[PDB]
Amino acid sequence: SSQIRQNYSTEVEAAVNRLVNLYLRASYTYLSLGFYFDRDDVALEGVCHFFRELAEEKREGAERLLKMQNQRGGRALFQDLQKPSQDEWGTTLDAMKAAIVLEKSLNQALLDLHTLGSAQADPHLCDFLESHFLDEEVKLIKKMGDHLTNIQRLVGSQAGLGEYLFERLTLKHD
Amino acid sequence: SSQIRQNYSTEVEAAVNRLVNLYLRASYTYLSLGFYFDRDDVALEGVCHFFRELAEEKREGAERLLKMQNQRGGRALFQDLQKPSQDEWGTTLDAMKAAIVLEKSLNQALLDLHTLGSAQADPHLCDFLESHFLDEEVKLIKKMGDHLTNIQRLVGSQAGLGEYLFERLTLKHD
Amino acid sequence: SSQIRQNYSTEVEAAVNRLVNLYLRASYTYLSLGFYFDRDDVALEGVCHFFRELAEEKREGAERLLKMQNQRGGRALFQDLQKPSQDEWGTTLDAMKAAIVLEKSLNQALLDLHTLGSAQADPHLCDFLESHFLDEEVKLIKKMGDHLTNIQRLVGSQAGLGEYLFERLTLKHD
Amino acid sequence: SSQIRQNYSTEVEAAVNRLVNLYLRASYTYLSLGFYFDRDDVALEGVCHFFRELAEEKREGAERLLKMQNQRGGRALFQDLQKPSQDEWGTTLDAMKAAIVLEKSLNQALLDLHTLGSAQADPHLCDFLESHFLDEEVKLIKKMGDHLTNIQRLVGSQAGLGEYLFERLTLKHD
Ligand SMILES: [Cl-]
Ligand SMILES: [Cl-]
Ligand SMILES: [Cl-]
Ligand SMILES: [Cl-]
Ligand code: NA
Ligand code: NA
Ligand code: NA
Ligand code: NA
């Protein structure tokens, strides 16, 4: 059982398990986005790489949460991972909009857990989120917003040209 | 407008713009202090360098605030920068006293913004200040207090000798 | 007071202080331009970097003037720094037009100070401006004019595409 | 005679020869100052080195003038070098005062030659002085003024202590 647990509420323990589920769901969503942009009839390598890198990032955030759960003496509990919301993700613009929606949902879940931690007087939890999650999320949302603006600027009357150019000249590819 | 802004109050946005103004005013004050100590009739190179380095530090703090404003989806708004409070800054002791007064005013503005952020349940803001500003300010005020004590010890009956020695043996020069 | 001052008119001393104010105002204008292009709803990194680099250049020109003021035995006097003329800067084309207007105003202030120096038979002042300011300004205005022409060529019927391409393929970014 | 001389007035030629004499006189004055501070009953090594370095600098300025005279097709004419104004130079403060008097006299001779060159429409002469002499002189006078202020600050009630400290902690020695 637990010889180490101290100042770690059941409420936080459960909310940490839920947040793990959210991050793993987000990782799965990004795996799907990545492989969609690798289709031969989509073929935007930079976009594929962007989302594959995010899949890895979100899995790593879940892993950090799970490590912390054990450091505090809580017990990891895993639930089913729901499949992503779509099977096909449309244009790069559609995809980047869906991504920022997903990130704002994760960000709100971080803020909600921070609020709970604050209410439970759990400063280690609050510090953990501040130190490893909140700014990383703000930076990522800023990046996505920058991308959305550039994608939107490029639609013009020539959407295919713009989608190609964005992939070639903004996103990282081989 | 804003596709990214989340949990970022208008109150904090405005107070961040005011704090930018305060840091840029402080930078300007230190530019003036630096060039005063470079006058041929003042000629304390170490003192000049101390204050020139602080001008740069304060500008860099303003720049970090402005970067954060954009990361959060707020809008930078610039106001006039008032000129420094003095044209001539007296002795090294007078200057270092004015500097610690200025730093305590910046520190209180940091604390006030932290309080606002706390009241607005904005943990990213609170973390940002804690991580990049509050300890830097405490360390700087401690340094200035150490300097004031050594300057004061050196006045004795021989103020010019003491002011020379402090500049030569404590402050960094070529 | 002054044990060093020689052949340095009160008229030049005052005009040097005014020119410092102009360069610091220009630096502030460029800080504002830079952060505007870093907004998530503007998001032109190359444009942001261009103007941030100019902010630094103009501050450095002010610092050189202030160093010279002290070398000559004049007294630096600082005035309020008025806020930039706009809070939002429009398109890259609008911004680059505003920049060349600002540079031509600085250039005329340089020429005016040169004329004063000439009239005061102050060859050190005249040399100083020729050696550190006049050609730097001519080169910068030429660069801006080259940029304006390329920006203008790119508007065509597809303004967003052109603004993206200019930022990606002419301006320096990561 | 002269196959090369072009746009080089007899007035400038003669004034260049006079300026050579002035620089060589100044060099001789600094040789005397240097050896005075090397006396066993004066013994301020840093002060000795300061003035010995200036002797070399002034000789080098004379040599540059003589090189230029020949480049223009004028004829070097040498006159007697009057001995320095004093045999003993008093305190470091007395010496540094005499040095700034001497430098302001050289500086005025530079400005006077510039005026003549301007009146003779001799832009190569004017450029030569601006490029190799006027700023070097301004920088040197600023340095001397900085030194005088520090020396003066150190007199206090304890002149010998202050003169030692200045030599040890400001001036370059082994
Ligand atoms: Cl489902
Ligand atoms: Cl004011
Ligand atoms: Cl204004
Ligand atoms: Cl004689
Ligand atoms: Na909270
Ligand atoms: Na607080
Ligand atoms: Na002119
Ligand atoms: Na002249």
Euclidean distance between CA atoms D74 and D16, whole angstroms: 9
D73, D125 in Cβ contact below 8 A?
A: no
Q: How many CA atoms lie within 13 A of B62 on its CB side?
A: 25
Strand partners, B81: C81
Cβ–Cβ under 8 Å, residues D89 and D32: yes
- What are phi and psi for residue B60, nearest 5 degrees? -60, -35
- Quick one: tokens of D34? 């240097």
Residues whose CB is less than 8 angstroms from the CB of residue D120 and which lie 6 or more positions away in sequence, other chains included: D9, D11, D12
d(CA B38, CA B32): 10
Closest CA to C13 of C111, C133, C116: C116
Establish, for the pair of chains A and C, how many residue pairs have beta carbons separated by less than 8 Å: 42
For residues B56 and B66, give the distance between their C-alpha atoms in angstroms, rounded to a whole number.
15
User: With the C-alpha atoms ordered D109, D111, D114, D119, is the resulting torsion angle positive or negative?
Assistant: negative
> Is residue D56 annotated as involved in ligand binding?
yes
Chain C nearest C-alpha distance from D102 (Å): 12
CA dihedral D128, D130, D131, D137 (to 10 degrees): 120
What is the number of domains present in chain D? Answer: 1
Q: For the beta carbon of residue A135, count every other beta carbon within 10 angstroms.
A: 16
- B160 belongs to a structural domain: yes
Angstrom distance (rounded) from CA A131 to CA B127: 8
Q: Which two tokens stand for residue D18?
A: 């006079």
The Cα D140–Cα C71 span in angstroms is: 9
Residue type, A58: K
- Residue B53 annotated as part of some ligand binding site: yes
How far is A135 from A32, CA to CA, in rounded Å?
25
Q: What are phi and psi of A164, to 5 degrees?
A: -60, -50
Phi, then psi, of A87 in degrees rounded to 5 = -95, -25
DSSP C133: I
CB contact under 8 A, C6 and D104: yes
**Residue B5, domain member (yes or no):** no
In a domain, C1, yes or no: no
Distance CA A40, CA B152 (A): 76
Structure tokens at D173: 């020695």
Ligand of minimum distance to the alpha carbon of A25: 1
Instruction: Tell me the C-alpha distance between B24 and C82, whole Å.
Output: 12
* D71-89 CB burial, b ≥16 within 10 A, e <16: ebebeeeeeeeeebeeeeb
Q: Which residues contact C20 (CB under 8 A, 6 or more apart)?
A: C62, C65, C66, C69, C76, C78
Domain CATH for C31: 1.20.1260.10
Pair D12, D116: CB distance under 8 Å: yes
- Cα dist. C61→C21, C122, C134 in Å? 11, 20, 11
Structural contact between residues C96 and C144, judged by C-beta atoms closer than 8 angstroms: yes
SS3 D41: coil
Q: Residue B8 C-alpha to ligand 5 middle, in angstroms?
A: 12
User: What is the maximum span of chain B, computed from C-alpha positions, in angstroms?
Assistant: 65
Distance from CA of D167 to the nearest CA of B (A): 12
How far apart are alpha carbons B30 and B163 in whole angstroms?
19
Tell me whether C3 touches chain D (CB under 8 Å). yes
Spatial distance between the Cα atoms of C133 and C117, rounded to a whole number of angstroms = 14
Separation in Å, CA of A165 to nearest CA in chain C: 9
Domain interval for residue B40: 10-170
The two tokens of residue A124 are 């280690």
What's the maximum distance between 2 C-alpha atoms anywhere in chain D? 65
Chain C residues whose CB is inside 8 A of the D142 CB are 4, 70-71, 73
Helices and strands in chain C, H and E counts: 6, 0
Nearest-CA distance from B61 to chain C in Å? 13
**Spatial distance between the Cα atoms of B158 and D153, rounded to a whole number of angstroms:** 9
DSSP 8-state secondary structure symbol assigned to residue D156: T
Neighbours of C71 (CB within 10 A): 21
Asked if C48 contacts C34 with a C-beta cutoff of 8 angstroms, the reply is yes
Question: How far lies B164's CA from each of A91, B91, C52, D147, in Å?
Answer: 69, 11, 39, 12
Angle, vertex CA B96, rays to CA B90 and CA B98, nearest 5 = 75
Whether residue B77 is contained in a domain is answered as yes
Residues 6+ apart with CB under 8 A from A152: A93, C160
How many whole angstroms from C79 Cα to the centroid of ligand 2? 8
Name the one residue in this structure whose structure tokens are 């002791």.
Answer: B93
Pairwise CA distance, residues B86 & B35, whole Å: 13
Torsion sign, CA atoms A91, A93, A94, A100: positive
How many Cα atoms occupy the beta-carbon half-sphere of A135 within 13 Å?
Answer: 16
Q: How far apart are CA A74 and CA C58, in angstroms?
A: 57
B46/B108 Cα distance (integer angstroms): 28
User: In the PDB record, what is the listed experimental method?
Assistant: X-ray
CA distances in angstroms from A168 to A164, C40, C71, C165, listed in the order given: 6, 20, 53, 11
What is the rounded end-to-end Cα distance, in angstroms, of chain B? 50
Alpha-carbon distances of A90 from A94, A99, A127, B74, rounded to whole Å: 6, 12, 38, 30
Task: Assess A170–C contact: CB distance below 8 Å, yes or no.
Answer: yes
The contacts of residue C9 (CB under 8 Å, 6+ apart) are C120, C122
Of B8, B18, B11, nearest in space to B106 by CA: B18
Binding residue per annotation — C63? yes
In total, chain C counts a number of residues equal to 174
Q: Is C113 exposed, middle or buried (0-12, 13-18, 19+ CB in 10 A)?
A: buried
- Output the DSSP codes for A93-132: HHHHHHHHHHHHHHHHHHHHHHHHHHHTT-HHHHHHHIII
Candidates B4, B35, C53; CA nearest to A147 is B4
Supply the Cα-derived Rg of chain C in whole angstroms: 18
Yes or no: say if D93 and D28 are a contact pair by the CB < 8 Å rule.
no
Minimal Cβ distance to D162: which of B41, B42, B161: B161
Answer yes or no: do B76 and C35 touch at CB < 8 A. Answer: yes
* CA pair distance B44, B36, nearest whole angstrom: 9
A7: left (phi over 0), alpha (psi -120 to 50) or beta: left
Asked if residue C4 lies in contact with residue D100, where contact means CB atoms within 8 angstroms, the answer is: yes
Q: Is the dihedral of CA C71, C74, C78, C84 positive or negative?
A: negative
Residue D138 at interface with chain B, using a CB cutoff of 8 Å? no
Tokens of C74: 């004049």
Rg (alpha carbons) of chain A, rounded to whole number: 18
Resolution (A): 1.5
Q: Which H/E stretch holds residue C86?
A: none
**Burial label, A171 (beta-carbon count in 10 A; 0-12, 13-18, 19+):** middle
Q: How far is the CA of C22 from the centre of ligand 3 (A)?
A: 13
Rounded-to-integer distance, Cα B20 and Cα B5, Å: 19
Q: Is A80 helix (H, G, I), strand (E, B) or coil?
A: coil
- Joined together, the tokens standing for residue A19 give 């947040």
- Are A76 and A17 contacting, i.e. CB atoms less than 8 angstroms apart? yes
Residues of A in contact with C173 (CB under 8 A): none
| Backbone φ, ψ for residue A139 (5° rounding) | -60, -40
How far apart are the C-alpha atoms of D19 and D105, rounded to whole Å?
Answer: 11
Whole-number Å distance between alpha carbons of A55 and D70: 77
Cβ-proximal residues to D71 (8 Å cutoff; 6+ apart), any chain: none
Residues across chain B: 174
Q: Is C60 annotated as a binding residue?
A: yes
Q: Tell me which residue has tokens 């280690």.
A: A124
| CB–CB contact B128 A107 (8 Å) | no
| Residues of chain C found within 8 Å of residue A145, distances taken between Cβ atoms | 40-41, 43
Q: Say if CB D13 and CB D74 are below 8 A apart.
A: yes
Domain membership flag for residue D138: yes
The conformation of residue D133, written as its DSSP 8-state character, comes to I
Cα four-point dihedral sign C150, B67, B15, A136? positive
Q: Which helix (H) or strand (E) holds C170?
A: none
Q: Which of residues 78-137 of C touch D (CB under 8 A)?
A: 121, 123-124, 126-128
Question: Residue B95 is which amino acid?
Answer: A
Q: What Å distances lie between residue C170 and A164, B115, C51, C150, C173, CA to CA?
A: 19, 45, 14, 9, 9
A161 and chain C in contact, CB less than 8 A: yes
Instruction: Kindly determine whether residue C121 and residue D130, on different chains, have CB atoms separated by under 8 Å.
Output: no
Q: What distance lies between CA C135 and its chain's CA centroid?
A: 13
Task: Please report where in the chains the tokens 């300026």 appear, as a residue.
Answer: D19
Q: Could you tell me if B154 and B166 are in contact, meaning their C-beta atoms sit under 8 angstroms apart?
A: yes
What's the rounded Cα separation, in Å, for the pair A119 and A113? 10
| 3-state secondary structure labels for all residues of chain B | CCCCCCCCCHHHHHHHHHHHHHHHHHHHHHHHHHHHHCCCCCCCHHHHHHHHHHHHHHHHHHHHHHHHHHHHCCCCCCCCECCCCCCCCCCHHHHHHHHHHHHHHHHHHHHHHHHHHHHCCCHHHHHHHHHHHHHHHHHHHHHHHHHHHHHHHHHCCCHHHHHHHHHHHCCCCC
Residue B42 near residue D149, CB atoms below 8 Å: yes
Alpha carbon distance B169, B46 (integer Å): 9
Strands (E), C39-152: none
CA dihedral C34, B12, A112, A141 (to 10 degrees): -10
* Rounded Cα–Cα distance for residues A41 and A128 (Å): 43
Q: Give me the total of CB pairs closer than 8 Å, taking one residue from chain A and one from chain B.
A: 44
Largest Cα–Cα distance of chain C, in whole Å? Answer: 65
Taking each helix axis as running N to C, give the angle between helix A45-72 and helix A92-119, from 0 to 180 degrees, rounded to the nearest 10.
Answer: 10
What distance, in Å, lies between the first and last C-alpha atoms of chain C? 50
H helices of D38-73, in order, are: 45-72
The count of other CB atoms within 10 Å of the CB of residue C63 is 18
Nearby residues of B105 by Cβ (< 8 Å), 6 or more positions away: B22
- Is residue B130 domain-resident? yes
C83–B79 C-beta distance less than 8 A: yes
- The overall longest dimension of chain A from CA atoms, in Å, is 65
Looking at all shown ligands, the one closest to residue D130's CA atom is 8
Crossing angle for the helix pair A135-155 and A159-169, to the nearest 10 degrees = 140
Q: Is B2 a domain residue?
A: no
Query: Helix, strand, or coil here: C10?
Result: helix
Tell me, yes or no, whether A27 lies in a domain. yes
For residues C38 and C48, the answer to whether their CB atoms sit within 8 Å is yes
